[PDB]
UniProtKB/Swiss-Prot annotation, chain A:
Protein name: Transcription initiation factor IIF subunit beta
Primary role: TFIIF is a general transcription initiation factor that binds to RNA polymerase II. Its functions include the recruitment of RNA polymerase II to the promoter bound DNA-TBP-TFIIB complex, decreasing the affinity of RNA polymerase II for non-specific DNA, allowing for the subsequent recruitment of TFIIE and TFIIH, and facilitating RNA polymerase II elongation.
Stretches assigned to coiled coil: none
Residues of the full protein shown: 251 to 300 of 400
Subcellular location per the Swiss-Prot or TrEMBL entry: Nucleus
SS bond partners: none
Further facts: Present with 520 molecules/cell in log phase SD medium.
Similarity remark: Belongs to the TFIIF beta subunit family.
Domain of life: Eukaryota
Oligomer and partners: TFIIF is composed of three different subunits: TFG1/RAP74, TFG2/RAP30 and TAF14.
UniProtKB/Swiss-Prot annotation, chain B:
Transmembrane segments: none
Protein's gene: RPB2
Originating species: Saccharomyces cerevisiae (strain ATCC 204508 / S288c)
Name of this protein: DNA-directed RNA polymerase II subunit RPB2
Covered range of the whole protein: 393 to 490 of 1224
Subunit: Component of the RNA polymerase II (Pol II) complex consisting of 12 subunits.
Localization per record: Nucleus
Swiss-Prot record, chain D:
GO CC term, one of those recorded: RNA polymerase II, core complex
Renumbered zinc finger spans (C4-type): 6-26
MF terms in GO: DNA binding; DNA-directed RNA polymerase activity; zinc ion binding
Source organism, top-level taxon: Eukaryota
Binding partners and assembly: Component of the RNA polymerase I (Pol I), RNA polymerase II (Pol II) and RNA polymerase III (Pol III) complexes. Component of the RNA polymerase I (Pol I) complex consisting of 14 subunits: RPA135, RPA190, RPC40, RPA14, RPB5, RPO26, RPA43, RPB8, RPA12, RPB10, RPC19, RPC10, RPA49 and RPA34. The complex is composed of a horseshoe-shaped core containing ten subunits (RPA135, RPA190, RPB5, RPO26, RPB8, RPB10, RPC10, RPA12, RPC19 and RPC40) where RPA135 and RPA190 form the DNA-binding cleft.
Binding-site residues for Zn(2+), renumbered to this chain: C6, C9, C23, C26
UniProt PTM: The N-terminus is blocked.
Location(s) in or outside the cell: Nucleus, Nucleolus; Peroxisome
Further facts: Present with 907 molecules/cell in log phase SD medium.
GO biological process terms, semicolon-separated: nucleolar large rRNA transcription by RNA polymerase I; ribosome biogenesis; RNA-templated transcription; termination of RNA polymerase I transcription; termination of RNA polymerase III transcription; transcription by RNA polymerase I; transcription by RNA polymerase II; transcription by RNA polymerase III
Protein name: DNA-directed RNA polymerases I, II, and III subunit RPABC4
Family that this chain belongs to: Belongs to the archaeal Rpo12/eukaryotic RPC10 RNA polymerase subunit family.
UniProtKB/Swiss-Prot annotation, chain F:
Zinc finger (TFIIB-type): 5-38
Its job: General factor that plays a major role in the activation of eukaryotic genes transcribed by RNA polymerase II.
Protein name: Transcription initiation factor IIB
Family in the record: Belongs to the TFIIB family.
Biological processes annotated in GO: DNA-templated transcription initiation; RNA polymerase II preinitiation complex assembly; transcription open complex formation at RNA polymerase II promoter; transcriptional start site selection at RNA polymerase II promoter
Misc. remarks from the entry: Present with 6750 molecules/cell in log phase SD medium.
Species the sequence originates in: Saccharomyces cerevisiae (strain ATCC 204508 / S288c) (Baker's yeast)
Length: 37, 92, 49, 45, 41, 279, 110
């Protein structure tokens, strides 16, 4: 069956929206005239 | 032998909360799975950084579940599924 | 209250059209308009002041 | 100010205007109007 | 478990008596254990 | 010119019309001599039963979907005909940014009031000389922070930087010039309980740092030094008031800070342990 | 209620059904109307030349209307024209136009 996460919620809920913990992953990060002549 | 009679009750089926929600939740996850892939393809095309937060939109599940039980519609496909609770008496 | 379709029909059985005229005008909406003598269409800009 | 009562612990707060909708101690927000102090006359009939 | 994320951002417990008065959604969040991969073929 | 009908009682003629309107009869009566003025008052709450100039103005649009027993190619002709006529106006970028605004606002879980003020702020700037480029996301995220301040919310720069790449120095100056536009078109206590919600703390412990952060300003010494870490040392002091097992390493990874910083703030705080007790 | 006038008060008898000539509308309408907007740009008054200019009949009691004057309980409104550069058919006259084409010549038009 599906387990239930049973804490004070907002610890787990803090990672949902903004959390200021960016990246932590490496997935999709992306002359003279006579002389030159 | 005679004709098949469609008025036999056992030949019909009923749909409660579960198999109604199985039709809905399959479609809502079907929409979001492609839109995550839309965030996959456009990120490597426009050459930017990936973001799992921006990859998945919660409103694909949030607005889907709220608006469906709001009206009697389910899809206009199906209609009149949800009604308000009858509280004229305890027998109601 | 709504003066229905069939309720008009019972008044024709009696036939007193004066009650039929009074009900659908003064009790309903009354209006005084103006039209030209030639082209019988609502066109005349009235300024009876 | 006007006298306000909490939902759960029923603590008399009696705050004022622009004082935020948040009860003290308990974290409830359902506040109450509280009853008046003047008499109400009825009839037995 | 059923919860409400309030307007400031507190995501705490929930009880249906308050949910009847505040006109909300007696609802619980759902979470997915996601796995990311990359094939280089 | 004029176009205002002043309804006055010719019997009285003593004042501007202090009259009465019989809404239950749809009539307006003189409130002095007792004479009616005009029958058949039209209503205002009646036409709203079958049903935005603040943002869209006078601009209208009509969605043309398919019918039910029609040809599918005809809708393709109209949307191509709608496609050639999208350059008659320039509001197509506005609704596209608004879709991106609604994309960012709902992913940030912010309520619909913050959706209002952000589109309110973006419509004020929209397109002027002082913009010029600015990478679009920057004036979006600035108006996002406008919705943080105007709707009394508590958002940080790194919180938006955890979502968007705005490169800070471009982000703040573009936020600064938009403020002067708002100036040209005429409080860390809110940040406290969100972190308490991030840590999962009781309300008496939540208001314990509130009385801490209140009295920390009036006490003075060492001044600001950004209130973010001043908020988190109010947390670490009031958690040292009790016995909750968190310490500095877990709260360091939580709010993304520095363990060595808060112990230096703890140094001035343990001296200031006197002027902070309430019960 | 209504203000007294002196026009001959009669009744309607024969009623004729007819169609419009386009120059007849230009001899009746009072405005060209080019602005697709509703009210003013300042979110008040009117566009004047938009979809609800004061040249037409007004409502909302306190508004007076231009050419009709009076109020909404007396003004019956007016009419305006919009002319184009390209004629189109009418939905009610599709097949009735089609039957004419199935009965007349396409060159001499006989
Ligand atoms: Zn209380
Ligand atoms: Zn003049
Ligand atoms: Zn009077
Ligand atoms: Zn008029
Ligand atoms: Zn011919």
């Amino acid at each position: 069956r599906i387990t239930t996460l049973d804490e004070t919620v907002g610890v787990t809920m803090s990672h949902t929206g903004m959390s200021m913990r960016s990246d932590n992953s490496n997935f999709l990060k992306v002359m003279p005239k006579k002389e030159i002549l | 032998k005679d004709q098949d009679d469609r008025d036999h009750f056992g030949k019909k089926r009923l749909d409660l909360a579960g198999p109604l929600l199985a039709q809905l939740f399959k479609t809502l996850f079907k929409k979001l799975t492609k839109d995550i892939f839309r965030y996959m393809q456009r990120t490597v095309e426009e050459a930017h950084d990936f973001n799992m937060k921006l990859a998945i939109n919660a409103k694909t599940i949030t607005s889907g579940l709220k608006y469906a039980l709001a009206t009697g519609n389910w899809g206009s496909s199906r209609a009149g599924v949800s009604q308000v609770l009858n509280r004229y008496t305890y027998s109601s | 209250l709504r003066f229905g379709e069939m309720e008009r029909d019972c008044m024709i059985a009696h036939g007193a059209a004066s009650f039929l005229k009074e009900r659908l005008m003064e009790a309903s909406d009354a209006f005084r308009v103006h039209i030209c003598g030639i082209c019988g269409l609502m066109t005349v800009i009235a300024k009876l002041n | 100010t006007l006298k306000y009562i909490c939902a759960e612990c029923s603590s008399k707060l009696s705050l004022s205007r622009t004082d935020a909708v948040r009860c003290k101690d308990c974290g409830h927000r359902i506040l109450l109007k509280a009853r008046t102090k003047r008499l109400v006359q009825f009839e037995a009939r | 478990k059923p919860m409400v994320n309030e307007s400031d951002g507190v995501t705490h417990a929930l009880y249906p008596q308050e949910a009847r008065l505040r006109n909300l959604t007696y609802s619980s969040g759902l979470f997915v254990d996601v796995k990311k991969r990359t094939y280089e073929l | 010119p004029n176009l205002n009908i002043v309804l006055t009682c010719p019997e009285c003629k003593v004042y501007p019309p202090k009259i009465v309107e019989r809404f239950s009869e749809g009539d307006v009566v003189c409130a002095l001599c007792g004479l009616v003025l005009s029958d058949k008052l039209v209503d205002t709450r009646s036409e709203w039963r079958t049903f935005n100039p603040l943002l869209d103005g006078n601009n209208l649009s009509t969605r043309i979907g398919k019918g039910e027993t029609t040809d599918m190619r005809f809708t393709k002709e109209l949307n191509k005909a709608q496609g050639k006529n999208v350059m008659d106006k320039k509001d197509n970028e506005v609704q596209a940014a608004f879709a991106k605004i609604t994309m960012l606002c709902d992913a940030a879980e912010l309520p619909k009031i913050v959706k209002d003020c952000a589109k309110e702020a973006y419509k004020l700037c929209h397109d002027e000389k002082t913009l010029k480029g600015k990478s679009m996301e920057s004036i979006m995220a600035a108006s996002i922070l406008i919705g943080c301040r105007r709707a009394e919310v508590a958002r940080t720069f790194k919180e938006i930087q955890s979502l968007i790449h705005v490169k800070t120095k471009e982000f703040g100056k573009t936020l600064n010039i938009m403020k002067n536009i708002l100036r040209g078109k005429s409080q860390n206590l809110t940040y406290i309980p969100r972190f308490c919600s991030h840590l999962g703390l009781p309300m008496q412990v939540t208001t314990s740092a509130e009385y801490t952060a209140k009295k920390c300003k009036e006490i003075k010494e060492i001044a600001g030094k950004s209130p973010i870490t001043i908020a988190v040392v109010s947390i670490y002091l009031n958690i040292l008031l009790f016995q909750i097992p968190i310490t500095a390493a877990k709260v360091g990874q939580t709010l993304q800070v520095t363990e060595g910083t808060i112990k230096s703030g703890y140094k001035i705080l343990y001296e200031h342990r006197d002027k902070l007790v309430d019960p | 209620g209504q203000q007294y006038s002196s026009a001959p008060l009669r009744t309607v008898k024969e009623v004729q059904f007819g169609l419009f000539s386009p120059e007849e509308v230009r001899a009746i309408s009072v405005a060209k109307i080019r602005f697709p907007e509703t009210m003013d740009e300042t979110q008040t008054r009117a566009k004047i030349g938009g979809l609800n200019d004061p040249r037409l009949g007004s409502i909302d009691r306190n508004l007076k209307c231009q050419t009709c004057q009076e109020g909404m309980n007396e003004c019956p409104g007016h009419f305006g024209h919009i002319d184009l550069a390209k004629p189109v058919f009418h939905v009610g006259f599709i097949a009735k136009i089609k039957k004419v084409c199935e009965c007349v010549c396409m060159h001499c038009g006989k």
